[PDB]
Design a protein around this ligand. Structure first.
Ligand SMILES: [Zn+2]
Ligand SMILES: [Zn+2]
Ligand SMILES: [Zn+2]
Ligand SMILES: [Zn+2]
Length: 108
DNA sequence: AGATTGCAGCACCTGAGTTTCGCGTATGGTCACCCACTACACTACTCGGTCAGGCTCTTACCAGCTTAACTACAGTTGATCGGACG
């Protein structure tokens, strides 16, 4: 919506941003080499609250997305969708007019 | 010097210029969520080479003979070869 009208000034940086706090998040993270959210359970650190929140689940068994078929736990919707698509007849015969459909790619 | 009258002084209701304000309307700004793309390391089924098993084909025969060619003996002549020349 609103136009990108805050330009990073550093040598060899191309980026422009919508609102000045975001330009500052970029500058402190990329160019100065500082981060604002530390893991309690390992050495790593993160640039956003949502990124530390994802990393915190990785230290735990009670992972926040749970499979509808097998009940395996995962941390975000992309992982869930890819995993659940393995519980489907995903693959299709690529050859002309052939009707068949398959569950594991080596079968196809 | 009184009957007629104006000045103008008192008080209280009122009006605008000026101000402060509330909202619309709309605009830049915070920040929280969750999505897309990327990617190092991984999961797992198939293909592929190799091997055995054991069923399978096809050979060619023994000494002799009897149909078939070689395989040695044998003689004057080549032209690379040694090793020395230019
Ligand atoms: Zn930059
Ligand atoms: Zn950690
Ligand atoms: Zn599952
Ligand atoms: Zn097919």
């Amino acid at each position: 919506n609103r136009p990108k009208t805050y330009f990073c000034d550093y040598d060899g940086c191309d980026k422009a941003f919508t609102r000045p706090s975001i330009l500052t998040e970029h500058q402190l993270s990329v160019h100065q080499g500082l981060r604002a959210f530390q893991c309690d359970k390992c050495a790593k650190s993160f640039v956003k609250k949502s990124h530390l929140e994802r990393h915190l689940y990785t230290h735990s068994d009670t992972k926040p997305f749970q499979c509808s078929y097998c009940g395996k736990g995962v941390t975000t919707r992309q992982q869930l969708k890819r995993h659940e698509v393995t519980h489907t007849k995903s693959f299709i015969c690529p050859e002309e007019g052939c009707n068949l459909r398959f569950y594991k790619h080596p079968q196809l």
